[PDB]
Amino acid sequence: MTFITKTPPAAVLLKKAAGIESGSGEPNRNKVATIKRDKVREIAELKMPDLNAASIEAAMRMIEGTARSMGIVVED
Numbered sequence: 001m002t003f004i005t006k007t008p009p010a011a012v013l014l015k016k017a018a019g020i021e022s023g024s025g026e027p028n029r030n031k032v033a034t035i036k037r038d039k040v041r042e043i044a045e046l047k048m049p050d051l052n053a054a055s056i057e058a059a060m061r062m063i064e065g066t067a068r069s070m071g072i073v074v075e076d
Contacts, residue, residue, distance in 0.1 A: 033072045
């Protein structure tokens with residue numbers, strides 16, 4: 001599966017953000033769930049430099065369209 005230059009893709013990244021690789025236990029997937037906005041700040045901070053963002057707003061609208069059209073929703 002690992003067949004790409006260093007650094008993972010964004011879509012997949014936001015995916016590991018939900019905590020797919022964590023203990024937790026009970027199933028946290030059933031109804032419309034939602035994550036926090038802090039995540040949109042962390043990821044956008046490590047990838048801020050990529051689409052000539054403005055400072056944080058433009059980069060904040062990109063990550064959202066990612067965790068908003070993928071599955072769960074994000075509350076900015």
